[PDB]
Amino acid sequence: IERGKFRSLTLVNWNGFFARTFDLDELVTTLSGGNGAGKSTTMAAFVTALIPDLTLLHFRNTTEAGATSGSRDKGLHGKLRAGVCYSTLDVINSRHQRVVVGVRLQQVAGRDRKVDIKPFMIQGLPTAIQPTQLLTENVGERQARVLPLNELKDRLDEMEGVQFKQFNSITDYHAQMFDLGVIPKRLRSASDRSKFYRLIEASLYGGISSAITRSLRDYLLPENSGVRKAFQDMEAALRENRITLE
Amino acid sequence: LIPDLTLLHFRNTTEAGATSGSRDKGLHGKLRAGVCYSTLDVINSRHQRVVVGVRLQQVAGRDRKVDIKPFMIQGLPTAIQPTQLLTENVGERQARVLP
Amino acid sequence: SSKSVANIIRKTIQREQNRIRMLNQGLQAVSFGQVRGVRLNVNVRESHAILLDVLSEQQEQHQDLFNSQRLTFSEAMAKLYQRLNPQVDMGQRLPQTIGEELLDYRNYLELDVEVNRGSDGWLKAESGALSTGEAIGTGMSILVMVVQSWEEESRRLRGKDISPCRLLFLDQAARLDAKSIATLFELCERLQMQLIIAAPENISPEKGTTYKLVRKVFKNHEHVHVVGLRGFG
Amino acid sequence: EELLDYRNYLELDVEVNRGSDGWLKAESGALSTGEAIGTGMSILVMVVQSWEEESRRLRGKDISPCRLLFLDQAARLDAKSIATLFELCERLQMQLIIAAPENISPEKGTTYKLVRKVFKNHEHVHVVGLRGFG
Amino acid sequence: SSTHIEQFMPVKLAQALANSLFPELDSQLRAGRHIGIDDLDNHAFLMDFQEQLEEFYARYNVELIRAPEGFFYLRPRSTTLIPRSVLSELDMMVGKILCYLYLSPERLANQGIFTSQELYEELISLADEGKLMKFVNQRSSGSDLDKQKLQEKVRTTLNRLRRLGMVYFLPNNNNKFTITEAVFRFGADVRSGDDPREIQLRMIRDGEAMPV
Amino acid sequence: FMPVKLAQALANSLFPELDSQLRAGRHIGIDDLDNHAFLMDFQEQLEEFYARYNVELIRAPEGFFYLRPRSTTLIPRSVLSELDMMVGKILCYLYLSPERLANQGIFTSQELYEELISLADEGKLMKFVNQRSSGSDLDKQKLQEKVRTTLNRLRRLGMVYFLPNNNNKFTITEAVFRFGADVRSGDDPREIQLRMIR
Amino acid sequence: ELVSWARKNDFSIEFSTLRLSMQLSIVANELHRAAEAAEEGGDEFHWHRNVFAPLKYSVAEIFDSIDMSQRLMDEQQNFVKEDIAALLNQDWQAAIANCEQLLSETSGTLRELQDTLEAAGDKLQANLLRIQDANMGSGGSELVDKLVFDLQSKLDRIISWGQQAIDLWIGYDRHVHKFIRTAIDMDKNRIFSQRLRQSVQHYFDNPWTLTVANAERLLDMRDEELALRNEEVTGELPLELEYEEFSEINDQLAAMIEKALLVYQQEQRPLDLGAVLRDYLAQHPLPRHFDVARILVDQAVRLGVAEADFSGLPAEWLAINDYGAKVQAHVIDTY
Amino acid sequence: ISLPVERLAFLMAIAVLNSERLDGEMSEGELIDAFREVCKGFEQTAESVAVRANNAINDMVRQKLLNRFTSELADGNAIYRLTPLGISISDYYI
DNA sequence: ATATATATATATATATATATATATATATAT
DNA sequence: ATATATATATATATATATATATATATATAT
Ligand SMILES: Nc1ncnc2c1ncn2[C@@H]1O[C@H](COP(=O)(O)OP(=O)(O)OP(=O)(O)O)[C@@H](O)[C@H]1O
Ligand SMILES: [Mg+2]
């Protein structure tokens, strides 16, 4: 079988990036540049596109990886510019379907460095349409402008064959992505989402993540309900015996 | 520099501030069986050549523990190197570290 | 009921041991520093095997502990685990939580990561006794095995026609040398794993695609300029 | 007792003039790896200088304590940052021991090439040394 | 002597009010929640210090009352310091039906676990379908849209009763439930073998039930 | 056991009414002489008693007491509408200094209605009544009725003391400062209040 | 995947324990015979006719028959529940004894079925493991393993149900007693039940409602409405990606040095880094010298070790050029 | 006995899962999932998934196709098992 | 005149309980 | 039909108590 692939990553109105699309590689994509180039920003934007759960997203420095820094800030807000921003993934499914998943990010006005995230998906987009252009409107002389979610919905609905969906919960977002062969595990419960984010977070910083090795049992071995049922049966028996004894 | 077993913790660069996870401090496995030495040579502003150092020994036992004994040497000639003081150039192929 | 419990735990443990032992042969002697191979050690814990035996055959002998109004079932299990096998010397953790932990079958197996460091055989992998590159390689091996296991488990729910996408990251790749990076590349391609790596210097000039980013201050704001790179010219 | 200490009366912060923006409080989460490493080294040399200044009055007037710092996994820094760090250490007469897995080749100072091997069924580190280049 | 609890409060009442269970129980009770045998901890707590709590709550002009079935609750007086409210007539229908299901052996196979659909089927079996529907909408004549409206209304009333402790949703399922003995209160007008019109006056006089 | 002074405070015959009004969210100011003095005296123990409920007994800088529910509050919580906070800020503004010459501490529903219409933006007014409305008689009547309802809701909280009669004319208490903004050195209270409201 | 198969198909429209014992005996005989035949061994045709035709069909059919008996018992449990439920409607207080008997007989029957099931489960499992052991006698016996893996679960599955059903029934039973202890104890004559029914039927002739405490909810301050940042950001769109190429000069230099140095390994000549570096650096301009030295060392240290490094005698810093370049390395002797 | 295409497909899926089920027990928590999957495959939405699933399970129970047992601990607080008629109808094609 | 055992102080890090913030389901009301 | 309020669960960081192991000075056996 032909495994699906991540074609490209698009960044809109990000810190440093206005509208930039990196075409990913079949095997390895490398990013270089002096300190502060913005590679970590690209990684963060990708992972935000993958797991938009705001509770999990925490972009600590590679130094103090997992060491509590008490900054009170997850670091995502400072990585976005004012206004609308987008982070999208084009994926070729094993069914050879081009699906553009993505999220609209937006800073929340106020002293708190808080952000709002709204996921979305597009199916059936023609292979000739690039997300960078799809998400921007050419206004002025070579001066494209970004358009909000409502405008994007209007633009896409006017097209033929493209199906756009907007999710009210990251749960359905993950469910749809899993349905299209994008995620290995079905993140039905919040614990599954936490484990998934733990895996990608350990990968990003690389190496032996303390939490992983500490819960390797939970991460590898599957949960069994028969043992739980048997223990509950024994619990009920013991409770009845105690009732009788008392 | 700091021969204190309480503070010495050679955790991996990764997990630079994370909890221990294990109980070992990572020093014992960096030593070899026998008597070992770690020495600095310093030239003061007064230009006194001082050899500070510590003798290390893997404390034989159930756990992976290390014994450290500090020491200082003053007035050494500038022509004698630390490796010579601590090692006997016996006729064998390899020298012998002396206690 | 206690006998039936112990039996089902034993069967589940045996099945999981067999599955993991079969999976272990999915590794092909990765070369990272002095680490020559990575392996998963699964073993039933004797401290817990004794507990299973007591539950399955000698439940009544310790009823005095079970039927105490002071102890809940989790606390009763914890106290029983304390009674037999008293040399484990658990820490300051409370009886309630340790019992609750005892109620999960997975706990009964020691599940650890072994590495064939140099020529010392297979040793338990402790971050405190491994170089940075060795630990990074071992962690990547663990993560790839975990994702493989997740894919395998979901093979039933998913359709027969879809293979989920595979992708991982590695920031500050400069911590790895050429040999380690070549080994990582060969592993990822053998496992059809996509990788996104970062390093200040182009550490992988002759494989995959590469980009270089330069940040320019420009009229009191910033812009990132991206330039593709090619192996030869 | 906390009030009895004058130091508690003081608020201390670390600020960086980051790019086009003014001075911002140094938050580990709002910086890249190299920036954080460099700021850490800066604060470390600040601490060393402060300690020397404090201890001078209890020492011989002609004693200057040695200053020496480390930097492991230096490959996380670019050439520009490494050059700036070298300039800083030189200006402060401060010795550095930097580890890099062959990625960087600092031309100034001493370099030590290490290679691990098996000899007589024992692990051995073959060591070679160079210096004076530049 | 001074600095002595008996000066202000009896020892047992103070001990009861300082117990870890007191706050949740008090908040639930003031919210209108009935307490049955199922909440073993709370029921035992009420039983042990039952008298102290009736006299404490009397200060609010509300009676902590234990029905003969063994379930405690609060009945406010006309001079209540805690506001008072009356269940809807549809709530009475569902409560009477719930009592029937508690006492009905035909559904014994269910083992106490019931679904809202079965409750609605039984309700329509025993009540007047269209004339009961009249209250859901004044212009109903059997329209299936109004039928779904009545089903939704029954579901909502069932949820409110769940809030009152008459019914418990299952630890994982909100579409199935288990009845509690508190439902017996819905039969207080018929537990005594006398004329209905005199028992109604007795109850309303006692504050048990206001009219509509 | 129980703290002795806590037992004394709970046993006091004032405790039932005050407890009911607190659990109802009412704010106890300096006007309620007996209740305010009781709370002043026994705060050190009622704070613990109401912290047992995962609620905080807060004495505002103005002086009035109230209960703030935490996320784990054991007292069924509820949230005021948008119109409720808007009306609260309107009254806080009306707790003004020229107010003394304007209404001498006694306002009427018409004052609040006119202030709300003139001061608030049209979009929020429509959001209150309904989006599709645009300057109509029925919509304005419904808005006035909702204004009366929220005024009653505030009365329940002790924010507004009605002058006793069916007619709508009341007085504003100091506790209304809860809706108010913080005061800085030299800031005009009018300006900061209006900036918050806008 | 079967959903599409069904869609295209377009289709639409004995509790006696003596039995269970006799099927178990038949199964025991056939399973033991098949296990012994497998253990004896034979060619591919013998393996087939002894372990695939006889075993497969017979064991599948008779395990299905045993499961069918369990299903018939399930039907009987359902029927007895319904009979109890109907009886309690007709006699109320007088059916208590009837229901207790029916519960007794059903419980006894379930226990006897469980006993009969466990009477042969262990030995059948042993025989099946024996067949597993003997299966590996040929390479084409893969299919046999499937049965030896399949016929396991069914058996155990059967036994599981034999207990699970009781676990369920012993539960349900209790409820019935509870009902009798709760529903009918306080309604011995049932009059309360009829009177409640008539009240329900004629409720609205006297509509009455109960009173319940409805304490007020603690009104709270609404958190400030969250307003996002909107600025209609605009900017230049990136051009087409440019490209740059990597210089392989260092690769060429490394190849040159490796070829120049392989002679030392070939001849096992003692290599002295000082002299070699001093000679070789003369061929390049000074600025490149460093980039040469490093590479040369990288090439040299892979070739054997230096024996003097174990002598405890530090080596000297030999100069390898003008301008002040120095090297510290012992002679490389042991190749 | 009346099995439309959707009901028949749900029954066949139930039989397949029971065949591949470890201990031969089916909680309704999985029956609802199976009905959701079959209805999704058949691409028809007369009502919500839950109501359709409940109606189909009840119809099969009363049509003598499934047997229900009340067990609170079970996922969905119920355990379902194929009846002899259901087994026969399922294996007639399988 | 020595080295081991004791008591003291200290940092480490282990665990618990608390409090906060976010996501979810879902039940109400226009 | 959908905006909105409400209850619940989980992850995450803070703060405190406590057991463990080591370092230092003194006491007492060798
Ligand atoms: N949340 C933030 N707030 C403010 N500035 C930020 C934020 N995140 C990143 N930056 C700045 O953006 C630039 C790029 O940061 P980033 O961490 O993405 O770079 P990088 O390429 O990964 O760097 P390095 O390789 O040195 O770690 C740096 O100036 C960093 O300080
Ligand atoms: Mg970075």
Whether the Cβ atoms of residue G73 and residue G15 lie closer than 8 Å to each other = yes
Q: Do the domains spanning F1-69 and F82-180 agree at the CATH topology level?
A: yes
Closest CA to H57 of H43, H68, H46, H70: H68
Residue C13's identity, in one-letter code, is I
Residue of C nearest to G248 (CA): C232
Domain F1-69 in CATH 3.40.50.300: no
Nearest CA to ligand 1 atom 28: A36
DSSP assignment string, E23-70: HHHHHHHHHT--B-TTSHHHHHHHHHTHHHHHHHHHTTTEEEEE-TTS
CA distance A218 to chain H (A): 22
Give the distance, in angstroms, between the CA of residue G189 and the centroid of all CA atoms in the same chain: 56
Binary contact (H73, A225; C-beta < 8 A):
no
Of C76, C146, C172, the CB nearest to A220: C146
What CA–CA distance (Å, rounded) separates A19 from A17? Answer: 6
Neighbours of chain C (3+ CB pairs under 8 A): A, B, D, G
Q: How many CB atoms are closer than 10 A to CB G52?
A: 17
- Strand I at less than 7 A from CB of C88: no
Ligand 1 interacting residues, C-beta cut-off 6 A = A 15, 33, 35-41, 75, 78-79; C 200; D 30-35
Q: Which residues of B touch C129 (CB under 8 A)?
A: 24, 26, 29
Q: How far is the CA of B70 from the C1' of J25 (A)?
A: 18
Binary contact (E86, G210; C-beta < 8 A):
yes
What CA–CA distance (Å, rounded) separates G120 from G98? Answer: 34
- Strand I at less than 7 A from CB of E66: no
Entry resolution (Å): 4.6
Technique used:
cryo-EM
What CA–CA distance (Å, rounded) separates G14 from H89? Answer: 20
Q: Annotation-wise, does A114 bind a ligand?
A: no
Binary contact (A16, C194; C-beta < 8 A):
no
Give which of H61, H70, H79 to mutate to test E binding, by max E Cβ within 10 Å.
H70
Task: Name the residue with the least CA to C1' distance from nucleotide J22.
Answer: B6
Q: Which of residues 3-32 of A touch strand J (CB under 7 A)?
A: none
Residue D86 CA to ligand 2 centre (angstroms): 21
Query: Residue G190 to residues D110, E183, E193, G92, G123: CA-CA distances in angstroms?
Result: 102, 17, 12, 7, 54
Q: For a pocket test of ligand 1, which of A9, A11, A14, A15 has the largest count of ligand atoms closer than 8 A to its C-beta?
A: A15
DSSP assignment string, B22-87: SS--SSGGGS-SSEEEEEEEEE-TT--EEEEEEEEEEE-SSS-EEEEEEEEEES--TT--HHHHHE
Q: What are phi and psi of C200, to 5 degrees?
A: -60, -35
- Strand I at less than 7 A from CB of C94: yes
CA distance G145 to chain E (A): 40
Of H54, H70, H77, the CB nearest to E173: H77
Contact with chain D for residue B46, Cβ under 8 A: yes
> Backbone breaks in chain B (C–N > 2.5 Å) follow which residues?
none
Q: How many CB atoms are closer than 10 A to CB H76?
A: 21
Query: Residue G125 to residues G38, G122, G132, G147, G252: CA-CA distances in angstroms?
Result: 16, 5, 10, 13, 70
Q: What is the dihedral of CA F178, F184, F189, F193, to 10 degrees?
A: -60
Task: Classify strands A163-166 and A115-123 as parallel, antiparallel or unpaired.
Answer: antiparallel
Q: For a pocket test of ligand 1, which of C196, C215, C217, C225 has the largest count of ligand atoms closer than 8 A to its C-beta?
A: C215
Task: Name the residue with the least CA to C1' distance from nucleotide J14.
Answer: A70
Q: How many CB atoms are closer than 10 A to CB F165?
A: 7
Closest atom of ligand 1 to CA, residue A42: 18
Helix (H, G, I), strand (E, B) or coil at D133: coil
Looking at the DSSP bridge assignments, the partners of residue G321 are G325
Of H50, H70, H75, the CB nearest to E110: H70
Cβ pairs bridging A and B (under 8 Å): 27
Task: Name the residue with the least CA to C1' distance from nucleotide I22.
Answer: A55
Which token pair is E104? Answer: 């009905």
Q: Which residues of A touch D29 (CB under 8 A)?
A: 59-61, 69, 71, 73-75, 78
Report long-range pairs for G311-317 (Cβ below 8 Å, ≥24 apart).
G311/B89, G311/B94, G311/B95, G312/B83, G312/B84, G312/B86, G312/B87, G312/B89, G312/B95, G313/B83, G313/B84, G313/B89, G314/B81, G314/B83, G317/D129, G317/D131
Q: How far is the CA of D100 from the C1' of I14 (A)?
A: 35
Residue E104's identity, in one-letter code, is S
Looking at the DSSP bridge assignments, the partners of residue C40 are C113
Using a threshold of 3 CB pairs under 8 A, tell whether chains B and C touch: yes
Residue A39 CA to ligand 1 centre (angstroms): 8
Q: What are the structural domain ranges in chain F? A: 1-69, 82-180
Q: How far is the CA of B22 from the C1' of I14 (A)?
A: 12
Q: For a pocket test of ligand 1, which of A40, A61, A76, A85 has the largest count of ligand atoms closer than 8 A to its C-beta?
A: A40
Closest CA to D42 of D98, D85, D73: D85
Whether the Cβ atoms of residue C169 and residue A203 lie closer than 8 Å to each other = yes
Topology of domain E5-76 in CATH is Arc Repressor Mutant, subunit A (1.10.10)
- Which DSSP symbol is given to E188? T
- Strand I at less than 7 A from CB of F72: yes
Q: Annotation-wise, does B30 bind a ligand?
A: yes
Binary contact (A62, D79; C-beta < 8 A):
no
Q: How far is the CA of C127 from the C1' of I4 (A)?
A: 36
Topology of domain E89-187 in CATH is Arc Repressor Mutant, subunit A (1.10.10)
- Which DSSP symbol is given to E210? E
What CA–CA distance (Å, rounded) separates E86 from E185? Answer: 13
Q: Which of residues 117-156 of A touch strand I (CB under 7 A)?
A: 117
Which token pair is C54? Answer: 């007591």
Helical residues (DSSP H) of chain E, grouped into ranges: 11-17, 22-31, 40-48, 50-58, 89-103, 116-126, 129-136, 144-163, 196-206
- Kindly provide the residue ranges of all beta strands, DSSP E only, lying in H1-94, ordered along the sequence: 26-27, 66-70, 78-82
Which of the nucleotides in strand J have any atom less than 7 Å away from a protein CB atom?
5-7, 9-14, 18-19, 21-23
Binary contact (H22, A226; C-beta < 8 A):
yes
- Strand J at less than 7 A from CB of A55: yes
Closest atom of ligand 1 to CA, residue D31: 31
Which nucleotide in the DNA or RNA is closest to residue B18, CA to C1'? I13
Tokens 């992505």 appear where? A177
Residue C33 CA to ligand 2 centre (angstroms): 24
- Kindly provide the residue ranges of all beta strands, DSSP E only, lying in C3-133, ordered along the sequence: 35-44, 109-117, 123-124
What CA–CA distance (Å, rounded) separates C127 from C129? Answer: 5
Which token pair is G157? Answer: 């599955």
Report long-range pairs for E128-132 (Cβ below 8 Å, ≥24 apart).
E132/E93
What CA–CA distance (Å, rounded) separates G144 from G52? Answer: 7
Q: What is the second-level CATH architecture of the domain F82-180?
A: Orthogonal Bundle (1.10)
Neighbours of chain A (3+ CB pairs under 8 A): B, C, D, G, H
What CA–CA distance (Å, rounded) separates A87 from A45? Answer: 6
Q: Which three-class secondary structure string do you get for chain G? A: CHHHHHHHHCCCCCCCHHHHHHHHHHHHHHHHHHHHHHHHCCCHHHHHHHHCCHHHHHHHHHHHHHHHHHHHHHHHHHHHHHHHHHHHHHHHHHHHHHHHHHHHHHHHHHHHHHHHHHHHHHHHHHHHHHHHHHHCCCCCCHHHHHHHHHHHHHHHHHHHHHHHHHHHHHHHHHHHHHHHHHHHHHHCCCHHHHHHHHHHHCHHHCCEEEEEECCCCEEECCCCCCCECCCCCECCCCCCCCEEECCCHHHHHHHHHHHHHHHHHHHCCCECHHHHHHHHHCCCCHHHHHHHHHHHHHHHHCCCECHHHHCCCCCCEEEEECCCEEEECCCECEC
Residues 6+ positions from G91 with CB-CB distance below 8 Å: G98
